């Protein structure tokens, strides 16, 4: 008899190797405290974003039935962004109802990086920030830059 977490563990180990060997630009991730199901990721703020210069940390919890359910992913660095709330929750469809077992943590991290460079104001977790992104982009840029300075340095 195997452990019920055998297929998830096998899958997470493979994803860890793939991520290690070819990470999405400016990302890294892996187990914290030797728990294969609890990782931390780091995203360096993309050069084309007002997040440039920043280091952003995220917590990833994989479910026991990975890859048949999505990982839980949250920022733990504060970030000013229409699609990321103060709890660090991320508005990404594939982390909600659109997960597929074909997707991987590398794909999630690549999608998050893409979001930082290109917010989706039509899908807002923080409507006020979406409205500012759309109507007063210079203000959004400078507040994003200020928070990067205060929280991600």
Which residue range is the domain that position 20 belongs to?
A: 1-153
Residues near 46 by beta carbon (within 8 Å), at least 6 away in sequence: 26, 52, 113, 116, 117
Q: Would you call the peptide bond into 67 cis, given omega within 30 degrees of 0 as the criterion?
A: yes
CATH number at residue 121: 3.10.110.10
Q: Which of 33, 15, 55, 47 is nearest to 149 (CA)?
A: 55
Is the Cβ–Cβ distance between 43 and 116 less than 8 Å? yes
Whether 91 is catalytic: yes
Integer-rounded Cα radius of gyration of the chain: 16
Using CA atoms, how far apart are residues 49 and 113, in angstroms rounded to an integer? 10
| Beta strand 27-31 pairing with 55-61 | unpaired
Quote the number of domains for the chain: 1
Q: At what resolution in Å was this solved? A: 1.9
Is the Cβ–Cβ distance between 134 and 127 less than 8 Å? no
Q: Which of 18, 25, 32, 118 is nearest to 67 (CA)?
A: 18
């Amino acid at each position: 008899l195997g452990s019920p977490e055998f297929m998830a563990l096998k899958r997470i180990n493979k994803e860890l190797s793939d991520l290690a060997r070819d990470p999405p630009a400016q990302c890294s991730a892996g187990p914290v405290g030797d728990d294969m199901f609890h990782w931390q990721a780091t995203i360096m703020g993309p050069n084309d974003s007002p997040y440039q210069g920043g280091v952003f940390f995220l917590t990833i919890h994989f479910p026991t039935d990975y890859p048949f359910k999505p990982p839980k992913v949250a920022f733990t660095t504060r970030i000013y962004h229409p699609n990321i709330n103060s709890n660090g929750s991320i508005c990404l469809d594939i982390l909600r109802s659109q997960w597929s077992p074909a997707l991987t943590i590398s794909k999630v991290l690549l999608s998050i990086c893409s979001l930082l460079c290109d917010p989706n104001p039509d899908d807002p977790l923080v409507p006020e920030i979406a409205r500012i992104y759309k109507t007063d982009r210079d203000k959004y840029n400078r507040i994003s830059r200020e928070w990067t300075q205060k929280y991600a340095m």
